[model samples]
Target chain A: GVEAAKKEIKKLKEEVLKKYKKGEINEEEAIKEFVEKALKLVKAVGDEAVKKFAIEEAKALVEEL
Target chain B: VVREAIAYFAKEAGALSEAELEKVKNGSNEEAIALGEKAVARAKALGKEKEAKFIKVLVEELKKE
Candidate 1:
C-alpha cells in the first residue's frame, strides 16, 4: 500500500536527519535525494510493464502523500 | 495496441524530454486496462487525470482536482 511507502519515507527521514547531522547533505538535498532514491525502484521495475505498475505505484504514492 | 496508443498520447502531451519520449517507444505491454476501474484508479494515482478527462468524464474528470 501507499501508506507502506510513507513508512519507508518516514524511516528514510530518519536517515536524512542522520545525513544532515553528519553534514553529508543540506535539507533540500536530503529530501530530494531521498525521493529520487526511493522512486528509482519504480522506473527501474517498469517499462515492459509500462503504465500498469507505474500507474499503480503512482496512485499508491499519491494516496500516501 | 493499447500500449502504442498510450505512448503516442504521452508523446503528444509534450511531457517527455526526447530523452523522455524515446523510452515510451517500442514498449511491450505485459498488461493493459485503464478504461474502467483501473483507468479511474490509475488516473487518480498518476495525479494527472486531467489528461484522461476526455474519456471517462464522469469517473476520472470528477477526480481531476
Candidate 2:
C-alpha cells in the first residue's frame, strides 16, 4: 500500500511538473498545487511512509523554486 | 531554519520578492516567526489546505526555537 501510494505521488509529481513546463501554471502555483493535491491524495491512504514521501517531494518541489 | 520555512510559503502563495526573500534570510528570529505565521494564515485563507498544514508544522517548529 505504501509503495502504491508512493507511485501515485511520483506520477502526480511528474504530471504537475509537466503542466508547469507546458506553461499551464506559474512556478509558485505549480508547487502549491502539487503539494496540496498530492498531500490530499496521500493523507487518505493514512500511511506514514506515504506521507513522508509526499512531504519530501513537496519540499523538493519547493526547493526547485 | 525558520527563515527557510517563511521562504517556502512566501514563495508558494506568490508573495515572494527579492526583498522579502532577503529579509527572511537575514531577519531576526522574531521577524521570521511572525512572517511564518502570516504566511500560514494566508495559505489557509487561499484554501491551500495541505500546503497550509505543512507550513503550520514548520511554523510550530519555529516556535520551538
Candidate 3:
C-alpha cells in the first residue's frame, strides 16, 4: 500500500507540474491543487514523518514557482 | 522542513526578502516562528488562504517545539 501510495503521489505531482507548466492553471491554483492532493495522499501513506516530508516537498514546490 | 515551509509562505505573503527568507530557513525555530506568524497575518490580509494555511501547518509544528 505504501509503495502504491508513493506511485500515485508521484503521478499526481507530475500531472500537476505538467499542467502548470502548460499554463492550464495559474501559479496559485497549481500550488493549491498540488498541496491539497499531497495532503490527501499523505493520508494514504499514514506515517507522521512521511506526512511532514510531503509538506516540506509542497513548500519546495511553491518556492520554486 | 518547518523552516522551509515558513520561508515559502514568508515569500508568498511578501513579508520577507530573499535574504530574510534565507535566514528563516537556516535560523532558529523561534525566529522562524516569529517571522512566520507575521507572514501568516499578511497572507490572510491579502486573502491568500492557501498560503496562510500552508504556513500555519508548520507554525503549529514549531509551536509543538
Candidate 4:
C-alpha cells in the first residue's frame, strides 16, 4: 500500500536525477516535470496513507546525502 | 499520522530547486484542479484510494492560480 508510494518516490527520484544527468532534462525541467510531480504525488497521497511512506521518505531524502 | 494524510510535510515544500536539490517548494494550489484529476487515476492503481477521494477535495480547495 504505502510501500507502493515509497517505491514510486524512489523510482521517480532516480529517474529525475538520471534524466538530469543524461541531459535529457535541465534543472528547470527536472523540477517542473519530475520533482513537482513527485511531491504532489506525495502530497496527494495525504497523511492518512503515508506514515511509513513518510518515514521512508525521510530516509530517502537522506539518501541524497 | 493517518498514513495518507501528508500533514507532516509542507504542501509547498518540494522542488524549489535541485542542489542536486534545495527549496520549500511551492506548487500552485491551482495545479490541484488539473493534477487532482490525474492523481485519481494513478492512486487507484497505487493502493491509494483514500487519496483519490481527497484529490477531489484538494481540487475544490484551490481557488486561484
TM-score of chain A of each: 0.44, 0.83, 0.73, 0.60
Model 2 ranges with Cα > 4 A deviation: B1-35, B38-65
Candidate 1 C-alpha lDDT tens digits along A1-65: 44444455456546666786688876445534544554453344434443344334332333332
Interface RMSD of each: 11.3, 8.0, 5.0, 11.2
lDDT of 2 by residue, B43-64 (tens): 7788765556557666565667
Against the true structure, candidate 1 has what lDDT?
0.40
Model 4 C-alpha lDDT per residue in residues A18-45, reported as the tens digit of each score: 7777889665455444434555666667
Q: Which candidate do you rate higher for TM-score, 3 or 4?
A: 3
What tens-digit string does per-residue lDDT give for candidate 3 at A1-65? 66666667667777887898898987767766776677678756776656556655675565556
Where model 1 places Cα greater than 4 Å from the true spot, the runs are A41-65, B1-65
TM-scores vs. true structure, each candidate: 0.28, 0.52, 0.52, 0.38
Q: What's the TM for model 2?
A: 0.52
In terms of lDDT, which candidate is strongest?
Answer: 3
Better of 2 and 4 by lDDT: 2
What fraction of the true interface contacts does model 3 reproduce? 0.06
Clash counts per candidate, in order, are: 2, 0, 0, 18
Location of the lowest summed lDDT over 10 successive residues in candidate 4 chain A: A56-65
- Cand. 3: chain B TM-score: 0.79
Of the pair 1 and 3, which is ahead by TM-score?
3
Interface RMSD of candidate 2, in Å, is 8.0
The C-alpha lDDT values of all candidates are: 0.40, 0.68, 0.71, 0.44
Which ranking of candidates, highest DockQ first?
3, 2, 4, 1
